[PDB]
Write a protein that binds this ligand. Structure first.
Ligand SMILES: [N]S(=O)(=O)[C][C][C][C+]123[B@]45[B@@]67[B@@]89[C@@]1%10B81%11B698B746B814B562B%10%1143
Ligand SMILES: [Zn+2]
Length: 257
């Protein structure tokens, strides 16, 4: 039932998912002057060389590229994390215009979109078990701004016409998620939640400081997706972002000075 519109959007979610009003909800505004540089934080280890992408899917809330997570093929380690986290999927949040779309904000700045690479902690064995744990997931968040094209995104863009509506999927093998990363792995980190239902408070967020640039043609193709299923009234898939939630008793740490 949930979505992003007036009658089923973020302000309604708490009725079915009461943790929406919890103590560690995401996203948040990252106040750059308040975030503390932590010299104990390690460099992030992103090991995606052996990634095996499987499918691309329109689930009526975003589109996702799914990966084989049955072995340590594409893993996140280091940074704020203990142990090893396997990549399961990535997806995006974006706006109707370039001045909104991101979930996290930086000194109240909204980016045009935000990429989430979702990983789960191998010590819990599968993602369904991991979402029940406070250290179950690690989501790597990357901002998108509009400028030059991102070559590593083009393969994704070019298949979106095949998954226009909710419930459509396609084969999406041999996609290298390394092509979606910025140069720097400088990051902010804090304890939070999923930003969609079920809003589980299971995520260590790692938000990269450096945005990637994508072209206007690339983001325009995101905005041609539909929230609806085929045969239902057409509703453009845009503004699929949750606003910033209260920071409450949390510290955002920076890996960089
Ligand atoms: N914006 S966000 O918090 O990254 C949405 C994650 C929803 C998910 B919940 B169920 B499916 C999709 B997979 B699996 B857990 B794992 B987690 B990922
Ligand atoms: Zn997300």
């Amino acid at each position: 039932h949930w979505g992003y519109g007036k009658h089923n959007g973020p302000e309604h979610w708490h009725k079915d998912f009461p943790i929406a009003k919890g103590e560690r909800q995401s996203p948040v505004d990252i106040d750059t002057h308040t975030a503390k540089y932590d010299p104990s934080l390690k460099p992030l280890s992103v090991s995606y060389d052996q990634a095996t992408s499987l499918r691309i899917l329109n689930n009526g809330h975003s589109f996702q590229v799914t990966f084989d997570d049955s072995q340590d093929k594409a893993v996140l380690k280091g940074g704020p994390l203990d142990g090893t986290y396997r990549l399961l999927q990535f997806h995006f949040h974006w706006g109707s215009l370039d001045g909104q779309g991101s979930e996290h904000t930086v000194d109240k700045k909204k980016y045009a979109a935000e990429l989430h690479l979702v990983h789960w902690n191998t010590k819990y064995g599968d993602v369904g078990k991991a979402v029940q744990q406070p250290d179950g997931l690690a989501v790597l968040g990357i901002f998108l701004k509009v400028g030059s094209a991102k070559p590593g995104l083009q393969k994704v863009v070019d298949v979106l016409d095949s998954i226009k509506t909710e419930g459509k999927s396609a084969d999406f093998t041999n996609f290298d998620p390394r092509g979606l990363l910025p140069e720097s792995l400088d990051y902010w980190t804090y304890p939070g939640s999923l930003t969609t239902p079920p809003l589980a408070e299971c995520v260590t967020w790692i938000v990269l400081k450096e945005p990637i640039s994508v072209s206007s043609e690339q983001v325009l193709k995101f905005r041609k997706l539909n929230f609806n299923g085929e045969g239902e009234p057409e509703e453009l898939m845009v503004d699929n972002w949750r606003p910033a939630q209260p920071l409450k008793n949390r510290q955002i740490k920076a890996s960089f000075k």
